[PDB]
Amino acid sequence: VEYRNWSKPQCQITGFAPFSKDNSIRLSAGGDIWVTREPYVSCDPVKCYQFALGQGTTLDNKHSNDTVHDRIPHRTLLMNELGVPFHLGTRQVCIAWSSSSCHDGKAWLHVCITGDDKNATASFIYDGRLVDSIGSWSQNILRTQESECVCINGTCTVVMTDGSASGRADTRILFIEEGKIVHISPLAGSAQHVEECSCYPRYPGVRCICRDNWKGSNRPVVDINMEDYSIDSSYVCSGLVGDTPRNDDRSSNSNCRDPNNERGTQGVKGWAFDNGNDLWMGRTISKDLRSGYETFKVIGGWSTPNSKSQINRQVIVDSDNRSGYSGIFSVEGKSCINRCFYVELIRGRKQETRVWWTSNSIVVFCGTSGTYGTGSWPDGANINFMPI
Amino acid sequence: VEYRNWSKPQCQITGFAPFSKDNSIRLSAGGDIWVTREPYVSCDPVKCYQFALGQGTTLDNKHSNDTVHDRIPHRTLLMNELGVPFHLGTRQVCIAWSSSSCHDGKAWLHVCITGDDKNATASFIYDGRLVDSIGSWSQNILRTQESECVCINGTCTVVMTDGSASGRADTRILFIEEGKIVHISPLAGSAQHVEECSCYPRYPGVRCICRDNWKGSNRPVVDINMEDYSIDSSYVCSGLVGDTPRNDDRSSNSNCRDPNNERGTQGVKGWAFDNGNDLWMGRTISKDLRSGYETFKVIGGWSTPNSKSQINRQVIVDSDNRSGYSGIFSVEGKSCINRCFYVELIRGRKQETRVWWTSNSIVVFCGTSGTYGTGSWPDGANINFMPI
Amino acid sequence: VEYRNWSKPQCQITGFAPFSKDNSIRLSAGGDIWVTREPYVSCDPVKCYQFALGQGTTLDNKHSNDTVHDRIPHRTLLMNELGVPFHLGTRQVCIAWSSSSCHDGKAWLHVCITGDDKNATASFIYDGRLVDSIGSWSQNILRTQESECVCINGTCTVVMTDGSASGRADTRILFIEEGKIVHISPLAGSAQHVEECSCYPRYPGVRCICRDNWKGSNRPVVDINMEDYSIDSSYVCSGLVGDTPRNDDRSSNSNCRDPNNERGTQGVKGWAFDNGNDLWMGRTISKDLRSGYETFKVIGGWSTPNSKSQINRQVIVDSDNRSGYSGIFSVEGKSCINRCFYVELIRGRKQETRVWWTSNSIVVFCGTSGTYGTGSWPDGANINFMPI
Amino acid sequence: VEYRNWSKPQCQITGFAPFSKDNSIRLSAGGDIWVTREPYVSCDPVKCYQFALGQGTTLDNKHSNDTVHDRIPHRTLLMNELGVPFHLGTRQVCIAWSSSSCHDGKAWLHVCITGDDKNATASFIYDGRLVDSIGSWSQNILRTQESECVCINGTCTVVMTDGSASGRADTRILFIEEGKIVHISPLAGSAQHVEECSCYPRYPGVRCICRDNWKGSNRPVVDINMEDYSIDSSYVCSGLVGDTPRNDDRSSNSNCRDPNNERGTQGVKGWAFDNGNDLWMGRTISKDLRSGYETFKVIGGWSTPNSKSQINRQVIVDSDNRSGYSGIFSVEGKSCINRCFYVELIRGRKQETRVWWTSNSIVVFCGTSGTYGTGSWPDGANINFMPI
């Protein structure tokens, strides 16, 4: 082998074509299916896998009660080929309530984090062996991407954050070769708060569109120079704006520089990416709840400090349906490299309360440069059919 | 590798020997088995797989209610090795309520179609990556083969149709290399209506025996020149005649040229193939319902404009049992290339109403040039044993 | 590759060491497990598989009622690695109520037989493709080994029988190269009746110890010359004697030549093999029912016309437990080639009637040239725990 | 290939990072999961597998009653990739109520032991074939490691014991090449009693830390010279002391030479390993029951005849939770070779009696040379949710 260096143009794109969907929640109504959440999908150089954090349990299981809770000793990183759902024959790849995987182009990397919330620990598993670990630097829930990392020439990159969600916290960027931490850099540039990044290979470095829980509903940006380990950070220019909750596109703002203090705390994992001067982005259809999903292009969304000019929209899930998290993945074609994405469709509690559990399913679309139509592909589970 | 060019004689044949059967419906009576329909089977250069459209659900599942409906956001293309049935550990290969797969002799192609009925979209997935897509040209249910495509030298061929089922509609033929559409040709020749084709490699081009919903109970023919992209279309000569519903072989007709207006609308997916001047064909045993299946040879069925001379008959499923769809697949031997076929045996609703779901099973036979006996191999599920 | 030519000495042996067991019946008491019978195990040049005839159903399944019956359209040849039991994720390899498999040392051969009892048909599947078939010559239940065939240099051998079980019937020996029948020879020598053979590679030819349903409780022998296709047949010399029912070893007889007319009809599948002049053999512990299993060596059992001198006995299943069929398999070591065997342990109806189904499990032992102890390894299922 | 010779330094280590956990017991509450106990994990040169002794049954199964009993004809050696739990699709690799596996660096070795307690027999399975066997030398429960063996240059080593648990018994050390016993050596040195060894490759020979049931709560040591087959045996120097039951570290003792007669009988499988002069070790947190697990380093624990100086502690399972067995496994890195371990967490009867079955789950940690935090990862199954 050689390593993945990702030196091809981004493919020009027109929108997004359907790719995959697993129907996980419908299946659990008469099936032995894992309770999960925070999915992602990533690809080795020949095929793609889906990943998720299990809740140490299946859905038709008295143990599935109260799985709203994010962190317990029984969450584990699941991995299957893209499209086969998480049944009992599924491999738990590590111990983890927070994770991130990628493939340098020889083996797989998994960064997995369990432990006490005040002194968690992250193990670095590469090609089978546990090659490294780190402890919690700020003693407050050590956490990572919940999506794909990226590797150029045998150096991978994850970004992690220890500290306060709704306050100043402590964000570093790890450079890791064959499972060994070979450099740590701290955040620079202007980004007030940088949780749950969605990263990708804009060749000679990496770019992430991340999540601000404190002061922002515009989304952060985190530039990583692969060669000398420099970092830069900003916010996306577009005044269309990526987070939930948010303000509404009459009364929305961003200057590409500072948070916006517009329902500026909480948030959700989401994604974006530049095209020359422009920006493709998705987001919930609701400004308030985590409902619906929509993509579009903003003209100028990358370059100019508040552009609200949107073309090529798409409704991936309709208004009247639930979604949740979301992120990006990149797959190299014969000539260019393409950008794809997934969205977690979460069901049950907090919101729906007829039942006592919390799980999700998924749907995935990939960038097309051709023609496409119109539709909407929700979870599709009648909660009345469901156990508990 | 080289590519599949299929340049070998057709094997001379005497009839058909059993090959496979999956018992899918019996198994669901105490098992966790997918709800499907429209199967097919196709083969990579070393083994064969079975394919079907799932209904986003399993049979012992409140969600299985009302699965008569053909198109929803949760249908997905399943794929297993030929003979292992669709359990929970099965990979959903794409999003689709209409499909077609083949293997050029390096990778797999899948053409998958979901969306709104008025503006569906078809994704082209080859070797993992989404390489292309197209939108709905006539804004009325974009649809395809529901069986195997065929590839010669790295150019594959699918035929698709947008428009009216019971009226004039819009039929084109796509030429696609490594997942990229490289040519589209429209239908020519005399065929009034060309749904659900069963295609195959009569070397230097491809031949399909298709389905007419509008004016015909004789079956269409669709010749495809692989080299310059010409098309021709006609109807099968034989007055024995392939569709259901149909007229009965005293009062049946075809001239090889025009539809026959003999209970000439609806139809079913079915197959045929020439042998010099002759025709091997199968069909339901019933002229009225989709019941029983039988094969035979018509002497002159290919060449002469109404031949009703049949030899080598075979009853694959008896009169008193249900069938449904059906199609052909081709597998290359050491010296010649052989032709095989499958039949979808569908159970439950509309017809049987004790239960509320709709699924099928399958049986598959391959062409033999040797001896054979007599039998009949139906689904075999006691509907009273069944859930719902 | 080259082909399997099996030119190594038989390993000298002291007895038999345990090898495998699948616990299939216990598992079905809370599991989704196939209803089967007539097992065998055979090995490709790197690992071993278990095979069985399914009943188109699983055990906790209203469809499992009345599965005493041997022949229906839903029996199918199952295949797994040795030790993983027949769950829902198991591949049905062909249509068959009678079968036999082997591996020439490049691909797998399966001979599968379904159809009407008066005009069955046997398909020949080699390396995926259906390469050949034959019809029923005597129009009375065409049937085969229900155990491993054997191949030397790319010519395999199965022996099959059409005709009467309890009367004269019609027995031939097929020679088949890459799935093509290349020679058929009829039975010669002295064997009055030759059902269910257990064959094996005594180098330059093959030897089978078979089953006589008509006139014999001594077991037949069927010698096959691989080079010119000659056949010879006799009975085993030993007066210890291999069938059930049988007479008891005070009042037992064989002359190596003719049947013995000693409770001489019915029978069971069983096995044996020469060692110089001696014979290793197993059989039920009961002369009357198919209960218990025991192995031992007879001194002179091969050469001398009624030897009742037995050493090295072993109780594989105790008197107070059920068994059934049984057969041999051969695996080549680094220096010699070894002989191993399996026994079908059948449960439920006819005999046990608390329940309405009929299935089995298995246990397998291999020849050792070392030390060993004492035990007994039965099915082990409490019928009261069982469904139905 | 070449063979595994394990000639690399031990990796210096700081402690242990989490690696894996399978959640087996929680899953059985709505899942089809094997009843087991005595796990271990071992690795081929590219990945790791988990192993366990099944009880011929699954947990939601009337057959699971009374599975406290250690030895029956239905125990079987299970094997999966590390992290996928023992479902119905799991391969039973041999017949066994006592076992040990390893991989010489070309194939897998399994030593499996079933039979009568007074005349058991151990089969030696290597690379598929049964290559050898031995009988019971002392006619009292022949037994082995219940963890990983180790192989240097194509000679493997298991240590086995026949005789009395609570008395003098008969302990030998087998040297075995490609499944053939090529040398047997008896125990020498000072070790009064040597059950259930945990062995590992301290290059040119092997070292085991074993279990004394008779006179000791300090743990034995069993040195094996790979070159001429010499043996030595002692006890661990540390006065901290490894067994359960034990005396408490105020009133604890060891001189590295003789048993200690301090609650000196029974015991549990456990592990340790030298580092220069020091000792890393784990043990239950309870001196009385098999509850909790903790690791730490003893300064001088290797070299000096009663050292009670402990640094680097870790609580792997908390006081208020159950554990059981435990052992070590070694995996070679790029430069050094690392040492890892697993602990069996056992649930149900004897102790918990609301239910009638006995199974376990597992958790596994690997040696890190980096940073780490704090936590505790128990089985996590609410016994009230459980069947029976």
Ligand SMILES: *[C@@H]1O[C@H](CO)[C@@H](O[C@@H]2O[C@H](CO)[C@@H](O[C@@H]3O[C@H](CO[C@H]4O[C@H](CO)[C@@H](O)[C@H](O)[C@@H]4O)[C@@H](O)[C@H](O[C@H]4O[C@H](CO)[C@@H](O)[C@H](O)[C@@H]4O[C@@H]4O[C@H](CO)[C@@H](O)[C@H](O)[C@@H]4O)[C@@H]3O)[C@H](O)[C@H]2NC(C)=O)[C@H](O)[C@H]1NC(C)=O
């Ligand atoms: C590729 O594919 C599509 C396939 O659909 C091509 O065009 C399609 O055009 C129709 C045009 O109307 C469009 O349907 C419309 O949009 C809404 C869809 O469903 C909503 O329902 C709930 C609401 O929360 C959500 O789940 C979901 O997210 C949507 O918001 C319909 O609401 C809408 O109906 C109303 O308006 C139409 C005119 O647009 C009127 O015909 C009706 O009267 C109705 O409302 C009534 O009258 C007035 C005015 O609306 C009021 O008093 C009140 O509203 C009253 O009840 C409408 O029919 C399809 O979904 C289109 N799809 C897309 C994707 O455009 C598409 O162009 C093609 N294109 C590309 C670019 O790929």
Ligand SMILES: *[C@@H]1O[C@H](CO)[C@@H](O[C@@H]2O[C@H](CO)[C@@H](O[C@@H]3O[C@H](CO[C@H]4O[C@H](CO)[C@@H](O)[C@H](O)[C@@H]4O)[C@@H](O)[C@H](O[C@H]4O[C@H](CO)[C@@H](O)[C@H](O)[C@@H]4O[C@@H]4O[C@H](CO)[C@@H](O)[C@H](O)[C@@H]4O)[C@@H]3O)[C@H](O)[C@H]2NC(C)=O)[C@H](O)[C@H]1NC(C)=O
């Ligand atoms: C390889 O294998 C076969 C193995 O069967 C070889 O030959 C077999 O020959 C017999 C000859 O009769 C044939 O059975 C006949 O065909 C019908 C089969 O079942 C039907 O049942 C229902 C009806 O809807 C459907 O499910 C199914 O699709 C079939 O239609 C039988 O109906 C028929 O019985 C009647 O006729 C026979 C004479 O043929 C009489 O013996 C009876 O009396 C009976 O009817 C009665 O008498 C008269 C006249 O029929 C009337 O008053 C009224 O009908 C009354 O009740 C018949 O027994 C096997 O299936 C043959 N099979 C094949 C495949 O040919 C075969 O030749 C060999 N060949 C090759 C070429 O491979």
Ligand SMILES: *[C@@H]1O[C@H](CO)[C@@H](O[C@@H]2O[C@H](CO)[C@@H](O[C@@H]3O[C@H](CO[C@H]4O[C@H](CO)[C@@H](O)[C@H](O)[C@@H]4O)[C@@H](O)[C@H](O[C@H]4O[C@H](CO)[C@@H](O)[C@H](O)[C@@H]4O[C@@H]4O[C@H](CO)[C@@H](O)[C@H](O)[C@@H]4O)[C@@H]3O)[C@H](O)[C@H]2NC(C)=O)[C@H](O)[C@H]1NC(C)=O
């Ligand atoms: C490797 O392993 C074995 C491990 O067992 C080594 O030797 C063992 O020696 C004992 C010796 O007795 C043997 O047990 C005997 O055999 C019978 C086993 O169980 C039966 O039970 C039912 C009956 O249908 C069946 O399920 C099953 O197939 C067997 O037939 C016992 O029946 C027998 O008990 C009676 O006889 C003994 C003396 O042999 C007396 O101690 C008792 O009194 C009892 O019967 C009573 O007294 C008299 C005379 O018997 C009568 O009034 C009446 O019977 C009354 O109740 C006996 O204990 C182990 O199984 C041996 N095993 C083998 C494999 O030999 C073995 O040698 C070693 N060897 C090698 C060669 O590998």
Ligand SMILES: *[C@@H]1O[C@H](CO)[C@@H](O[C@@H]2O[C@H](CO)[C@@H](O[C@@H]3O[C@H](CO[C@H]4O[C@H](CO)[C@@H](O)[C@H](O)[C@@H]4O)[C@@H](O)[C@H](O[C@H]4O[C@H](CO)[C@@H](O)[C@H](O)[C@@H]4O[C@@H]4O[C@H](CO)[C@@H](O)[C@H](O)[C@@H]4O)[C@@H]3O)[C@H](O)[C@H]2NC(C)=O)[C@H](O)[C@H]1NC(C)=O
């Ligand atoms: C990496 O991670 C850890 C993350 O926890 C870093 O430090 C942590 O520091 C706290 C300090 O207190 C420690 O918690 C303590 O230890 C016990 C943990 O739980 C027990 O509960 C049951 C008891 O059987 C078992 O299941 C289990 O095995 C443990 O034994 C607590 O018992 C303890 O609480 C009591 O003492 C504290 C002071 O230590 C007081 O705050 C309370 O008042 C309480 O008891 C009360 O007051 C007095 C004195 O105790 C008495 O009257 C009576 O006890 C009364 O109720 C305590 O809070 C975390 O678990 C630490 N973890 C570790 C791993 O050290 C850690 O340093 C960092 N380090 C490294 C080296 O990796």
Ligand SMILES: *[C@@H]1O[C@H](CO)[C@@H](O[C@@H]2O[C@H](CO)[C@@H](O)[C@H](O)[C@H]2NC(C)=O)[C@H](O)[C@H]1NC(C)=O
């Ligand atoms: C980035 O990746 C590919 C991976 O090998 C490099 O591949 C070389 O690129 C061309 C044609 O692909 C030539 O430079 C070499 O002879 C190619 N080898 C192969 C196997 O493709 C590419 O050059 C690398 N680029 C950078 C910028 O490092």
Ligand SMILES: *[C@@H]1O[C@H](CO)[C@@H](O[C@@H]2O[C@H](CO)[C@@H](O)[C@H](O)[C@H]2NC(C)=O)[C@H](O)[C@H]1NC(C)=O
């Ligand atoms: C069609 O396919 C096969 C695939 O390689 C071609 O194979 C060649 O055919 C013969 C013998 O098979 C010779 O022409 C070549 O040396 C063969 N190569 C191999 C690997 O078989 C065949 O010629 C191709 N035919 C056409 C008409 O394109």
Ligand SMILES: *[C@@H]1O[C@H](CO)[C@@H](O[C@@H]2O[C@H](CO)[C@@H](O)[C@H](O)[C@H]2NC(C)=O)[C@H](O)[C@H]1NC(C)=O
């Ligand atoms: C039977 O089988 C083996 C399979 O190749 C033959 O192998 C040859 O036998 C020896 C050493 O094994 C030499 O004759 C050849 O150079 C060997 N080749 C290999 C790959 O082993 C063996 O000779 C064949 N015997 C007969 C009697 O045909």
Ligand SMILES: *[C@@H]1O[C@H](CO)[C@@H](O[C@@H]2O[C@H](CO)[C@@H](O)[C@H](O)[C@H]2NC(C)=O)[C@H](O)[C@H]1NC(C)=O
């Ligand atoms: C132990 O194992 C390795 C396995 O091959 C041996 O490898 C050799 O070691 C070095 C570099 O690894 C050189 O001696 C050889 O050219 C190497 N070959 C490979 C494939 O690594 C190592 O020497 C063996 N050592 C002992 C002490 O036997």
Ligand SMILES: *[C@@H]1O[C@H](CO)[C@@H](O[C@H]2O[C@H](CO)[C@@H](O)[C@H](O)[C@H]2NC(C)=O)[C@H](O)[C@H]1NC(C)=O
């Ligand atoms: C990734 O690796 C290659 C290693 O060569 C880098 O490629 C350029 O690398 C050198 C620059 O010091 C040149 O000597 C090479 O010709 C050229 N490589 C090719 C294969 O085109 C590249 O800089 C590295 N990229 C990063 C982000 O570190």
Ligand SMILES: CC(=O)Nc1ccc(C(=O)O)cc1N
């Ligand atoms: C496990 C963890 O703390 N990561 C998270 C995942 C999801 C959510 C969430 O938005 O519900 C929050 C957090 N913090």
Ligand SMILES: CC(=O)Nc1ccc(C(=O)O)cc1N
């Ligand atoms: C999904 C789809 O529209 N294709 C079809 C499949 C089956 C039938 C059918 O004949 O029931 C009809 C159609 N149109």
Ligand SMILES: CC(=O)Nc1ccc(C(=O)O)cc1N
């Ligand atoms: C299917 C078939 O006819 N072969 C058989 C298998 C088992 C038995 C049996 O002994 O129950 C009999 C037969 N004839």
Ligand SMILES: CC(=O)Nc1ccc(C(=O)O)cc1N
């Ligand atoms: C099967 C067997 O005898 N080995 C054992 C395993 C566990 C225990 C145990 O400690 O419960 C004891 C023994 N002897």
Ligand SMILES: [Ca+2]
């Ligand atoms: Ca925010």
Ligand SMILES: [Ca+2]
């Ligand atoms: Ca029609």
Ligand SMILES: [Ca+2]
């Ligand atoms: Ca007989």
